[PDB]
Symmetry: D2
Subunit: 319 residues, 4 copies
Amino acid sequence: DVNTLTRFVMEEGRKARGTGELTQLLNSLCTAVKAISSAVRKAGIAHLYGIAGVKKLDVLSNDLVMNMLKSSFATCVLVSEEDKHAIIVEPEKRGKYVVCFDPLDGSSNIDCLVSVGTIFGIYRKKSTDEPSEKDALQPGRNLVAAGYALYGSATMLVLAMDCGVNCFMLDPAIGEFILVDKDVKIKKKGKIYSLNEGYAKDFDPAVTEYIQRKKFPPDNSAPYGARYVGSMVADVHRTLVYGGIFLYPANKKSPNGKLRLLYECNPMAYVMEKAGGMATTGKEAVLDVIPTDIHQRAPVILGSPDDVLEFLKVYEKHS
Amino acid sequence: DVNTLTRFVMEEGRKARGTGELTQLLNSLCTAVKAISSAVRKAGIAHLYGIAGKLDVLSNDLVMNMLKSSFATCVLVSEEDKHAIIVEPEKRGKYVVCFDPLDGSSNIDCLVSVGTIFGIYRKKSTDEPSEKDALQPGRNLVAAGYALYGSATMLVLAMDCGVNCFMLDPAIGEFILVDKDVKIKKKGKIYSLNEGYAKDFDPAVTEYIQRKKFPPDNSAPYGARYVGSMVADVHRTLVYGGIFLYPANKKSPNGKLRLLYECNPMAYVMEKAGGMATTGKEAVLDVIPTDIHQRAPVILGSPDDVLEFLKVYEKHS
Amino acid sequence: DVNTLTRFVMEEGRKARGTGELTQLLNSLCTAVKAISSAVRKAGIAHLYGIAGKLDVLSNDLVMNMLKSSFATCVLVSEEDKHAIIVEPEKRGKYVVCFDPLDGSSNIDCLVSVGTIFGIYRKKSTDEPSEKDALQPGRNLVAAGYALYGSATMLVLAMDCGVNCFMLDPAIGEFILVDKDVKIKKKGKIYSLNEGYAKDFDPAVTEYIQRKKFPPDNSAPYGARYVGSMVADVHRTLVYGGIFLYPANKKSPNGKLRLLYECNPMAYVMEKAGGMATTGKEAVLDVIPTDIHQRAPVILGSPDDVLEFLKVYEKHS
Amino acid sequence: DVNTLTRFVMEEGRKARGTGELTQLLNSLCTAVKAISSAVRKAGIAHLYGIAGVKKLDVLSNDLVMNMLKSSFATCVLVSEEDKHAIIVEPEKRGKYVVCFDPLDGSSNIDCLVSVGTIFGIYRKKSTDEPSEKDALQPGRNLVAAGYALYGSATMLVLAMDCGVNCFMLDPAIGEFILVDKDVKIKKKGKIYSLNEGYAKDFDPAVTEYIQRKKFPPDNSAPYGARYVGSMVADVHRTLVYGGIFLYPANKKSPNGKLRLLYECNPMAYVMEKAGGMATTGKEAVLDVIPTDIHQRAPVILGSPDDVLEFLKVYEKHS
Ligand SMILES: O=C(Nc1ncc(Br)s1)NS(=O)(=O)c1csc2ccccc12
Ligand SMILES: O=C(Nc1ncc(Br)s1)NS(=O)(=O)c1csc2ccccc12
Ligand SMILES: O=C(Nc1ncc(Br)s1)NS(=O)(=O)c1csc2ccccc12
Ligand SMILES: O=C(Nc1ncc(Br)s1)NS(=O)(=O)c1csc2ccccc12
């Protein structure tokens, strides 16, 4: 039987007898994602180039997510890559969830039409205090749902919850996210490694040795292939689909890495763990880091568990 | 003034007082590309999954049928077809087209960018049309380019007048001219290759990549990007500058990419944009092919980067 | 604040603390309507005409399959099906839906506006569901409305909270709330019927129409409009006011339009918008049906217009 | 073999060894029609209603046709329902054709989502004078091409030339007009009449009798059906497809009718004649009226020849 994202979530919600607020949030998020997809694919660009005689994509994407979530009546605190401070939803619109998101990840290189994406993580507000930026400082372990929209060769929404990870393809003919992969699990071990090797001169010695083993295996196994889109959503999604390992690790110049914990590392860590994968900073699971700043950075190494465990073996060798 | 692909080509064609055949070919190709884009973005996927109760093959059929019915072609070479396709006599025209209808589709399971690559030749021999008509060096190309099905769909068209970039507006199904007479940066800051073959690299590639990571002149190291889909990687090289490499390795001793419908079209785009494209030993466009699916090593991109690689290549004889 | 169909319905349902079954129903039907709109606008027609080398039946399949799989329905009555469809046991919910999946499609050859009409009832007994559950008077309707596939696609939804109009935005596949809690004009200036059947008119219809063309009170004559597709004509009546008639005559004592999935949903929309809908003898919503495909006369629209017609009808006993 | 509008016109042009200017014009007009269709179907309406936190359609349609034709390098004089004076294309953009068009016919009732359309008629400039409004004052007999786009349940472009009338369906998934009905001809006699009978009180006596014969045939044969969308392009297209008669006739209050000769009546008259139908004012062929004002009105009666002849017989009975 055919299934859609909204029908799927409604069915899960009715099973669990939830109030519907999470369903309202996710449906609102999906409307935003469809509007982002339409703009990213450049519908209406003819009008910008004078066919009859405004916002940058990252600003528009942020406004779409912000406005659809504010008006969902399901959220109270919103953290965006785009905004220095947490956004507090006005009282008459307040609901129970905190949402951290990157509305258009990878858009810095969108001039070359690289895949881009939207990343989100949804938390339940934990106290009855007046909503504040502190409501977003939860460890990823507290996530209620997380995932990403990938605006690639097609548009796909990957949604992770306690019930697992499910993948929905946007059918642009009808504007519906169609369930096409149910309860997906990552391969126990992959054959692809993904990181920016151009910065090898700055690598931590453990990263240098680990990548060297992928290219020059000590036994007679085949060396790993390399892929690095440079857009986190594309690279993580390939890691999910094909297995393997993705790294944006710490080094001496960047002791906490470069990617943002709240709306890049944690949601992808959560997707990976719900798919049977792993996500580490090198020192601990990404989902166990307790944040102190909504824009703080974190190292991240994630993907197939055998690959992440092997990296942890090499990392500990240099510790 | 706004411009579209078809209007651009008609205006160029009328200035040169051509017969119109190339315009008919390219307009037919653009129709196929729009249908490929629609399928790649999964329009109608709900019907496959039961709402009412093969992509590379479809892409090949769209290009083949649209090019056959244009009356502008006589010989068609596709990555999907073991032998050259000979257009039936009543539909025969003067052009030969080599193409990859959906380049990179082996990894489309992960929604990697994909694309269509094409190169267009005038039939040069007066013999009955056959597979040998597609065996001309890339230097003979009349037009070449690619459609990139990325975050948006863009058609890059290279001709003697230069390189022009057209964005597909899906709201109206029109390719809009957005970048005119494009030129690649003289030198870039990104290198692109599958470093997983580092064990098999010849010493020239090994040294060149080492120079990118550990620059001898204390300059900033290059960043690395490798999508693994040639159209995406080459299009980034065009837009941002830098260098793309797919050298030979033990699995691919004559290289991996196909000369006729991957290396030559991209090499032609690069050269028309003021860039370079070499096998290491010679310009890609000077290779005289003997087999329609033969492979070639390729290094291409910004001229200062390709020249720097060639200096390293010369150091190793 | 922007609003969409699914979000609007979820919010009403949560206020009323409903179980969610009606929302699952309406969301599934919306998915079907978007697939119907896409096919009606001929998306993909190039493939039927050979680029790579039924509509009313497809529409029925879309509605049937989305409602069956909604887990919200148990009995489905369609203009397309001789008997009621009984939803298979594991998929059963409490609602009965009568619908016309592509009303007006007999004239779709000329691209006349077409539409989907629906009315939703609660199951009548806890017995095994059967066709008898569809034999309720329109007064029992829980929700009703229509999608109009016109110059744009619009879904009109009537419930106890009133009538709301949602425009399909094809760029994102979302129904946008654009007209809230609509009320029809008290009196219009347009009458709508097939005057080609004047020879068969009941004398009251003849007299009423004469008053529209030759007003006794020296007011302006009404304009005439008759698309011949019920959804288009009824939607114009809602938006602009006036009167729509498909009345009984001596040859068709019960009219031509179907009571369960044409007249009742439109009468319910009309009454929720402050208009009226009569057979001439009684309110459409008060007819108790005995056959799921039975016909009904219908006169509907602005209250002053319908009351004026009813006064003429009473004049002729 | 599949055929599209642009491919069809290129092939006719190459056969006849034309210069290509008419093809550039028609291709430019097609681009405008696709943009009008997208706006008429309300693509992007979510943005007007606040999804992220402007012109009327008839104004936008006029700007689209005007700008695409100006920039086609194929035109010198443009007459539009929207503009009091003819537009004279600036010298650097001038071509040889004069175009009269109604960019969005029927839009007065678009609030109720009635079918609307674009009507066009194309003339060759006849004089060697500097271009002026006078170049648009040619009788419809001089038309080089004419037709219309109907934005109905689907979008269709009907194109009439000397080779006949051809119908192209817009496939929105790919933005191409697909040839679906070749060399179309109207029925010799139909069963539907089309006019606003609400104004019967003001009818010319000939119109009153003809309509009386349709509803009460003297031979007791079956009456005609009635249809009147009130949007000229919708009513005329149904007349072409199903046969019958469409009337917007003269009366004493409107002795020249109300529809406009240059960009409504002539193009529809030209399509009808190329399809083997008829189009009369009552007194003369629509295509033979020599206009003196670019916005002058004409009565029009058109459709199946046997139906138009019967109207003309009744019209003459009433001298
Ligand atoms: O949505 C609902 N209930 C509904 N009742 C009627 C309709 Br219709 S949906 N609950 S929830 O929003 O909390 C929710 C959405 S997924 C999920 C998974 C586990 C637990 C709860 C949830
Ligand atoms: O298209 C035409 N002629 C036309 N006449 C009327 C119309 Br309308 S198009 N010629 S061509 O096909 O050879 C062509 C297409 S780009 C280009 C660039 C250089 C030389 C020739 C060409
Ligand atoms: O949908 C729900 N409740 C929901 N809970 C959570 C989510 Br999320 S939706 N109830 S209902 O289906 O009966 C319904 C839909 S409109 C309407 C109007 C009046 C009464 C009931 C209804
Ligand atoms: O377009 C062309 N010639 C072309 N050359 C190359 C290409 Br490619 S098209 N001629 S025309 O514009 O005058 C034209 C368009 S339909 C038609 C019908 C009859 C006579 C002329 C025409």
